Amino acid sequence: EMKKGRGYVYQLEYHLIWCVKYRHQVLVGEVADGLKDILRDIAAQNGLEVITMEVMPDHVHLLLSATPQQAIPDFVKALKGASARRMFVAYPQLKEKLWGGNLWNPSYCILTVSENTRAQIQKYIESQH
Amino acid sequence: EMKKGRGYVYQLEYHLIWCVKYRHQVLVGEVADGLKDILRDIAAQNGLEVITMEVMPDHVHLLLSATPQQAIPDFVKALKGASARRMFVAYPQLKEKLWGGNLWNPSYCILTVSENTRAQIQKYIESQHDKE
DNA sequence: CGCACACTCGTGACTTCAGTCATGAGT
DNA sequence: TTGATG
DNA sequence: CGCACACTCGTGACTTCAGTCATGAGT
DNA sequence: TTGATG
Ligand SMILES: [Zn+2]
Ligand SMILES: [Zn+2]
Ligand SMILES: [Zn+2]
Ligand SMILES: [Zn+2]
Ligand SMILES: [Zn+2]
Ligand SMILES: [Zn+2]
Ligand SMILES: [Zn+2]
Ligand SMILES: [Zn+2]
Ligand SMILES: [Zn+2]
């Protein structure tokens, strides 16, 4: 069940969420579908496994499975920074409501995720011991 | 409960587990107590929050809470590397069965942990999207 | 209102060479 | 050009 | 015996200046 | 000097 690398055994999932700058509801129709392809492209280029992806009008959800060497600020920069660049290039109409050089809110929300709760894991540990 | 920093909001918990080199059963009594003290000191020096810690004779568990800037290999090196150095100095008797310069198995096991299950989070997000 | 994850200004790093990440401060 | 995502 | 998260040899980074982290490879 | 933790 555990993944394996040279110096470690792991199971790492993160739920990442970020919003459109000014909270504009622009991720719809063609722009939303284009973003899904662009994020898939960026994730494949960076060797990041995307478990699920949801694009809502003003925010994006990604559930990622990572190795211990894939640090959070690095994958968030790659996903948000490269997608904003590619999106403005592929969908220049985005510049009509976002002309300030930003597609994204500069903050992000990140959560570690597990199938069992921290409380259940704690109980399992005491039990094993 | 959701923490905040300059560019992010987060809740990051990990379950880290590692074993003694050769699987020797040496973490007992005062040796185990000293290890716990040393690990808490290292965690404090590094701004890592220790949620729980369990020391068994041949392995150690840590449930940690961290910021998005605390990368896994860095905190594992800080915890395992400095504790091995400090444990051998504080308990020289460890050298009787561990004379090769290693207190620890060179591998570590690490898992992300959430307060709620993945399923509960997924169901909550869907409810949020389905609202009004 | 008064911020601040969000708004703005500022710094530096580094890809996407633009627009994020890192980051303090003001509003 | 801001007002809320988990 | 081969294997590898675990044993061993090897490389480089960086604190803990030892003994981990990064890392490939042979058993 | 190893034999299994999550
Ligand atoms: Zn594409
Ligand atoms: Zn940012
Ligand atoms: Zn245990
Ligand atoms: Zn102390
Ligand atoms: Zn190692
Ligand atoms: Zn949502
Ligand atoms: Zn502030
Ligand atoms: Zn307003
Ligand atoms: Zn191998």
Beta-carbon neighbour count of residue B84 at 10 Å? Answer: 19
- Are the beta carbons of B35 and B88 closer than 8 angstroms? no
- Are the beta carbons of A91 and A84 closer than 8 angstroms? no
- Are the beta carbons of B64 and B18 closer than 8 angstroms? no
Write the burial class of residue A71 (CB in 10 Å: 0-12 exposed, 13-18 middle, 19+ buried): middle
- Are the beta carbons of B5 and A73 closer than 8 angstroms? no
Ranges of each domain in chain A: 1-129
3-state secondary structure of B48: coil
- How far apart CA A127 and CA B75 sit, in angstroms, is 27
Find tokens 């991720």 and name the residue. A27
Q: Which CATH entry fits the domain spanning A1-129: 3.40.50.300, 3.40.50.2000, 3.90.1170.30, 3.30.70.1290?
A: 3.30.70.1290
Residue type, B49: E
**Shortest CA distance to A84 belongs to which of A109, A68, A105?**
A105
Q: With the C-alpha atoms ordered A32, A39, A2, A8, is the resulting torsion angle positive or negative?
A: negative
CA distances from B58 to B6, B41, B48 (A): 40, 21, 23
For residue A124, indicate whether it is catalytic: yes
CATH number of B1-132: 3.30.70.1290
- How far apart CA B126 and CA B132 sit, in angstroms, is 12
Using a CB–CB cut-off of 8 Å, the residues of A that contact B are: 2, 7-15, 54, 56, 61, 63, 68-69, 71-73, 76, 106-119, 121-122, 125-126, 129
Contacts of B131 (CB under 8 A, 6+ apart): none
- How far apart CA A48 and CA A43 sit, in angstroms, is 5
Tell how strand B49-56 and strand B108-113 pair up.
unpaired
CA distances from A15 to A47, A55, A114, B39, B90 (A): 17, 13, 10, 29, 41
DSSP string, A41-64: HHHHHTT-EEEEEEE-SSEEEEEE
**Shortest CA distance to A55 belongs to which of A92, A30, A72?**
A30
> Which residues neighbour strand C (beta carbon < 7 Å)?
A 18-19, 21-23, 42, 45, 72-73, 76-78, 80-82, 84-86, 88, 100-109; B 2, 4-9, 68-69
Residue type, B91: Y
- Cα of B17 to ligand 9 centre, how many Å? 21
- Cα of B61 to ligand 6 centre, how many Å? 34
3-state secondary structure of A22: helix
Torsion angle of the four alpha carbons A104, A110, A116, A117, in this order, in degrees rounded to the nearest 10: -120
Contacts of B37 (CB under 8 A, 6+ apart): none
Q: Helices then strands (H, E): number in chain B? A: 3, 5
Backbone angles phi, psi at A107, to 5 degrees: -110, 165
**Shortest CA distance to A19 belongs to which of B7, B109, B49?**
B7
- How far apart CA A101 and CA A57 sit, in angstroms, is 19
Residue B94 DSSP symbol = G
3-state secondary structure of A107: coil
- How far apart CA B10 and CA A70 sit, in angstroms, is 17
For residue A56, list chain B residues with Cβ-Cβ distance below 8 A.
Answer: 129
**Shortest CA distance to B102 belongs to which of B19, B15, B17, B16?**
B19
Within 7 Å: CB of B129 and strand D? yes
Write the burial class of residue A112 (CB in 10 Å: 0-12 exposed, 13-18 middle, 19+ buried): buried
- Rg of chain A over all Cα atoms, to the nearest angstrom: 17
- How far apart CA A112 and CA B28 sit, in angstroms, is 32
